[PDB]
Design an enzyme around this catalytic site. Structure first.
Site, mmCIF file in Angstrom:
data_model
loop_
_atom_site.group_PDB
_atom_site.id
_atom_site.type_symbol
_atom_site.label_atom_id
_atom_site.label_comp_id
_atom_site.label_asym_id
_atom_site.label_seq_id
_atom_site.Cartn_x
_atom_site.Cartn_y
_atom_site.Cartn_z
ATOM 1 C CG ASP B 165 -2.169 0.894 0.968
ATOM 2 O OD1 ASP B 165 -2.424 1.247 -0.203
ATOM 3 O OD2 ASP B 165 -2.906 1.177 1.938
ATOM 4 C CD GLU B 415 -2.239 -7.333 4.863
ATOM 5 O OE1 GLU B 415 -2.230 -6.610 3.843
ATOM 6 O OE2 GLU B 415 -3.195 -7.387 5.663
ATOM 7 C CE1 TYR B 470 -7.464 -2.172 7.994
ATOM 8 C CE2 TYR B 470 -6.583 -4.273 7.265
ATOM 9 C CZ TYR B 470 -6.389 -2.986 7.726
ATOM 10 O OH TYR B 470 -5.114 -2.506 7.919
ATOM 11 C CD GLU B 506 -1.897 -3.933 8.546
ATOM 12 O OE1 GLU B 506 -2.903 -3.683 7.852
ATOM 13 O OE2 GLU B 506 -0.776 -4.155 8.047
HETATM 14 C C1 LIG Z 1 -11.530 -10.470 2.178
HETATM 15 C C2 LIG Z 1 -10.745 -9.582 1.210
HETATM 16 C C3 LIG Z 1 -10.673 -9.926 -0.196
HETATM 17 C C4 LIG Z 1 -9.899 -9.073 -1.134
HETATM 18 C C5 LIG Z 1 -9.250 -7.901 -0.658
HETATM 19 N N1 LIG Z 1 -8.553 -7.103 -1.531
HETATM 20 C C6 LIG Z 1 -7.895 -5.929 -1.038
HETATM 21 O O1 LIG Z 1 -7.175 -5.100 -1.907
HETATM 22 C C7 LIG Z 1 -7.948 -5.587 0.322
HETATM 23 C C8 LIG Z 1 -7.200 -4.309 0.783
HETATM 24 N N2 LIG Z 1 -5.821 -4.484 1.229
HETATM 25 C C9 LIG Z 1 -5.794 -4.621 2.661
HETATM 26 C C10 LIG Z 1 -5.780 -6.065 3.151
HETATM 27 O O2 LIG Z 1 -5.815 -6.290 4.317
HETATM 28 C C11 LIG Z 1 -4.941 -3.389 0.804
HETATM 29 O O3 LIG Z 1 -3.897 -3.263 1.354
HETATM 30 N N3 LIG Z 1 -5.087 -2.808 -0.531
HETATM 31 C C12 LIG Z 1 -4.758 -2.060 -1.738
HETATM 32 C C13 LIG Z 1 -3.628 -1.297 -1.784
HETATM 33 C C14 LIG Z 1 -3.306 -0.572 -2.959
HETATM 34 C C15 LIG Z 1 -4.184 -0.649 -4.141
HETATM 35 C C16 LIG Z 1 -5.352 -1.443 -4.100
HETATM 36 C C17 LIG Z 1 -5.665 -2.139 -2.963
HETATM 37 F F1 LIG Z 1 -6.793 -2.901 -2.929
HETATM 38 C C18 LIG Z 1 -8.665 -6.401 1.219
HETATM 39 C C19 LIG Z 1 -9.318 -7.554 0.740
HETATM 40 C C20 LIG Z 1 -10.091 -8.427 1.687
#
Ligand SMILES: Cc1ccc2[nH]c(=O)c(CN(CCO)C(=O)Nc3ccccc3F)cc2c1
Ligand SMILES: Cc1ccc2[nH]c(=O)c(CN(CCO)C(=O)Nc3ccccc3F)cc2c1
Lengths: 603, 603
Positions: B165, B415, B470, B506
């Site tokens: 991110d 992650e 989340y 987190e």
């Molecule tokens: C159940 C489920 C399924 C699919 C998911 N997809 C996601 O993306 C995220 C968001 N994620 C945080 C994860 O804890 C993030 O850090 N995202 C991000 C960063 C930059 C650009 C675009 C982006 F989406 C959560 C998620 C949860």
């Protein structure tokens, strides 16, 4: 005393600006009685140092504190400093600071923005660790240079009140440093550059040695000797010059040398070959009409207050470069030299100003009695000692900055009330003294608006007219139509009165970032644009107007009040340096003109 | 290799973090071929150095630049370093850096959050100046620690893609320096501190030397020799102690002395007497049921990017202290050592984490353009080299922080997508090797939510369960009522499966500072408060949950996207450190508990 910026030639710096020192307040003021400089600061907390102490701890009590605070840290003396002149230097210690190197007091200083140093050789042993204790005072009174009034209620609890806008940040705002020199050493230089219609002329040199024969030589950017000299105090070098120009700021290098029968000293001083003179309504640089654009700046940012920072500086200069600003005034106090060094190297033109703001008891947000003295110039308030301290402040500033080519004029003070009878009596000697101290620069004293062309008593004693004007804001509030008639009328008055070059050194309006309005009224980004736009129309109609410096490139902290929404909002940029729409307005006007040249009257 | 934090007695540093180096981009990637390190960088400009290059210039074309940049600087070498070891060290050079002393290639490093160094004695002459050129690379590819994919389009320009991110800041982020050493030098030290039932116990010391007999002496804060060791190989000093506790953090000073017949080398090491372990479903620091509070953090601030800053550090800690945070995580990369030196001194508990982030490939809503490998664990993408580079990352971090008592745990990665095939065969070896590098601290891998109890393949290999959740945000958008059910249902599903301590590393929600809503809905301060409340309520009902860290301490910068409103807004504080209403909410909960103590179910 003499002052030269430390560089590293036969000399060397242990920076010790290295951040972390011990810190604690003195709420009972028993710090000197108990000799705190003799033992580890008890009940102390970590503090970062170059910076203000106020904001570092997100604590209102520490931020609003009046009185004494203490810094402390242990440092090693380089073993290789065996037989050298070892000097301890503070680039700044805001308002006052006393210094102990292990129970041996070495310094005392009273001004917050200029360096003070002391030969600590007999008190330091090369290769050992020393305890450096600084006691810092952030109190102002009628003899301190920003005047002030420390008020103490029935409980003894002090409280600082002052008459300037910006917040009274304190602490060690700039580098402290141990530095080395041989026992034969250059310790003062003065270079005057002359020029005659831009093919060749000379640089007088004046050198004070700490007991040596001095030789001197002038070097190109590609490091070649273009001229050479011998003797002490006196010299005149002659050249076919690459002049220091507002655009680029070409710099030669004068290498001063000090020879004993045994020891050498090499000091390189950057020199900018340029002439600064006033002819009628014009501010000639290298015998050419120059037009100032830019900002009244401040030393202020989140967390660090007035603490210096290289990132902040790099960024701000990028911004001022982008927006097309060719100048600025060290608003209300000498700025960190690093700034002037940058200006020297990038051809940025600077109006160097003392910390002499606050002379005025008439800038008040009314209706709190807040008895101030009824006579501004009187033994109670601005008196003989004050004039001395003022003189002293001028001296210490010029001593430091006399060699910076970027500095094109001195500003003795900002917005004194010149109406009261003693005004002219107080300033006349200061204007004469300043000229003695430096004959090579025009002198000025920034003018507040209620001391207009008809009521001002001081401005004839200076060379350039620097006006702070807010028509349409504090007065004719939100009325551009009438503000314009007044502004232009007041400017023409000054033109015919003194026939000096006018620089509007302050013009701007509080503007909330993100406050938009169809009605283009006062605290909105749109108004800021309409206001600035109007001023610019007027300036381009008045020939004596030779400069425009917007009041503030960025929002800054002030003392709490009903006029200040979490501070001054007259910034073109926010305090985190995000641009209000007026920023793009200026970038068009400033980059749109021919560089350093006043607009034909219209686009 | 061997890494020691430079301190100052028979050793001395001239910090080269004298802001202002020469800087330039190499958009033609022809600098290496044209041997740019041999002369002065042309078309250069000043840059402050500690801190990202991206934001210093308020320029997009530089902010988003991917490729090589060049830092250059000159520095006089101290006369007193007469015939000594001279070591050039960079605390960090984000991602890659190659170093040249004048013309001598002295260094090369991949990894951006750990130091590297080398002896420069033969190429430098004390009393002279030397040119220092650093070629900095910011490119990320599959065999890099923050994995990524650079795409050169049809045009000759590169554009970086990555999977985490936070924004891809680069440049020289931390202190760079020259530091001196005798030719007999301690170059490595390792310390393990065993305690048992809090009455008394000893510390193993084990260290590497360049030919010298070691006198190991342990000291009070009062500098009294409370124990002594002997022999260049290790010891056990069994004395009754003063425990390094999270509350105040007492610190012993183990002085390490290496000896030749000619030279003597002294080195003080901060040593915190404490034990750490997992016992059932509890985290035991000094055999005590602990409870983590605090944040996931980022090295991020206005202007400077990920560059270190004492003021910023002094302030943030003042905040965490105030708000009640007793711990935090070096989120997604090794932080500057100062942070851990501060944590040691203040008893701040720290989950140390590698830059292993991005191992996942399902991490957003991509509307955008197909190809991005098909098999996460595959020669295309995460492969042999990438497990190697990964191992190498675990190594370096531990080689640096194995002696920081604040570090109570290692975080292998963040992650990772653990559903593809190679996931388990990839992390098993690294999980084994880590304990083999440091068996004194538990180890964890921070889990993404779509790997949940029934689907995660890799949690059993680690000691403590760290979960990013989340439930009221990305899923069950804005429904606290069901998000509670899911969360608890989920937490209890983890508990029964692994029976490990659970830390929520987190948990947070994007919140626009100043967005208020009577309807307490998403992206409003009211919502953030209500959401965090709801989580706390669930934690307060799961005996397994031993730790809570809110998502980011403060808003930070991310790559451009639809989900990121001028950056990640999940901060409890804004970027300039102004608190959101959630800060006072956390204030009450965190300071409100007994120190390091979970509520009695409810409270
Ligand atoms: C159940 C489920 C399924 C699919 C998911 N997809 C996601 O993306 C995220 C968001 N994620 C945080 C994860 O804890 C993030 O850090 N995202 C991000 C960063 C930059 C650009 C675009 C982006 F989406 C959560 C998620 C949860
Ligand atoms: C024509 C006229 C007559 C009387 C005036 N009085 C003023 O005060 C000001 C405001 N002044 C800016 C002067 O250029 C300011 O800096 N203000 C301030 C600072 C701290 C506390 C209270 C304060 F009002 C303008 C002014 C103009």
């Amino acid at each position: 005393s003499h002052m030269l910026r430390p560089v590293e030639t036969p000399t060397r710096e242990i920076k010790k600006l290295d951040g972390l020192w011990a810190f604690s307040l003195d709420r009972e003021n028993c710090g000197i009685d108990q000799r705190w400089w003799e033992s580890a600061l008890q009940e102390s907390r970590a503090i970062a140092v170059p910076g203000s102490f106020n904001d570092q701890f997100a604590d209102a009590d520490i931020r609003n504190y009046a009185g004494n605070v203490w810094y402390q840290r242990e440092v090693f003396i380089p073993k290789g400093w065996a037989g050298q002149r070892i000097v301890l230097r503070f680039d700044a210690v805001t308002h006052y600071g006393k210094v102990w190197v292990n129970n041996q007091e070495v310094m005392e200083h009273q001004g917050g923005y200029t360096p003070f140093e002391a030969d600590v050789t007999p008190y330091v042993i090369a290769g050992k660790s020393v305890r450096i204790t600084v006691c810092v005072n952030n109190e102002l009174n009628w003899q301190t240079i920003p005047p002030g009034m420390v008020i103490t209620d029935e409980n003894g609890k002090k409280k600082q009140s002052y008459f300037h806008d910006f917040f009274n940040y304190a602490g060690i705002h700039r580098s402290v440093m141990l530095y080395t020199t041989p026992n034969t050493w250059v310790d003062d230089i003065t270079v005057v550059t002359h020029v005659a219609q831009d093919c060749n002329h000379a640089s007088v040199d004046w050198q004070v040695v700490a007991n040596g024969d001095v030789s001197v030589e002038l070097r190109d950017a590609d490091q070649q000797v273009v001229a050479t000299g011998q003797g002490t105090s006196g010299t005149l070098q002659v050249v076919n010059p690459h002049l220091w120009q507002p655009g680029e700021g070409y710099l030669y290098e004068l290498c001063v040398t000090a020879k004993s029968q045994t020891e050498c000293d090499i000091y390189p001083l950057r020199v900018g070959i340029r002439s600064v003179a006033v002819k009628g309504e014009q501010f000639l640089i290298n015998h050419k009409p120059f037009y100032f654009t830019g900002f009244g700046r401040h030393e202020d940012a989140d967390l660090r207050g007035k603490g210096f920072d290289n990132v902040l500086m790099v960024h701000d200069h990028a911004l001022m470069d982008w927006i097309g600003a060719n100048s600025y005034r060290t608003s209300h106090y000498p700025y960190a030299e690093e700034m002037l060094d940058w200006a020297d190297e990038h051809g940025i033109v600077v109006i160097d100003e003392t910390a002499a703001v606050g002379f005025n008891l008439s800038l008040g947000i009314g209706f709190e009695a807040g008895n101030k003295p009824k006579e501004l110039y009187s033994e109670e308030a601005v008196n003989g000692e004050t004039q001395q301290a003022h003189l002293q402040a001028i001296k210490e500033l010029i001593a430091r900055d006399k060699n910076h080519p970027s500095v094109v004029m001195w500003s003795i003070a900002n917005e004194p009330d010149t109406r009261p009878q003693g005004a002219r009596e107080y300033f006349a000697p200061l204007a004469e003294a300043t000229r003695k101290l430096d004959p090579t620069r025009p002198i000025t004293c920034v003018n507040v608006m209620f001391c207009d062309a008809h009521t001002d008593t001081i401005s004839d004693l200076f060379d350039v007219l620097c006006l702070n004007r807010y028509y349409g804001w504090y007065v004719q509030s939100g009325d551009l139509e009438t503000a314009e008639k007044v502004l232009e009328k007041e400017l023409l008055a000054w033109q015919e009165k003194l026939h000096q070059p006018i620089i509007i050194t302050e013009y701007g309006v509080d503007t909330l970032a993100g406050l938009h309005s169809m009605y283009t009224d006062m605290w909105s980004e749109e108004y800021q644009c309409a206001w600035l736009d109007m001023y610019h129309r007027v300036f381009d109609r008045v020939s004596a107007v030779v400069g425009e410096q917007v009041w503030n490139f960025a929002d800054f902290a002030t003392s709490q009040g009903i006029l200040r929404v979490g501070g001054n909002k007259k910034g073109i940029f926010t305090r985190d340096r995000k641009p209000k729409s007026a920023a793009f307005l200026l970038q068009k006007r400033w980059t749109g003109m021919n560089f350093g040249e006043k607009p034909q009257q219209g686009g």
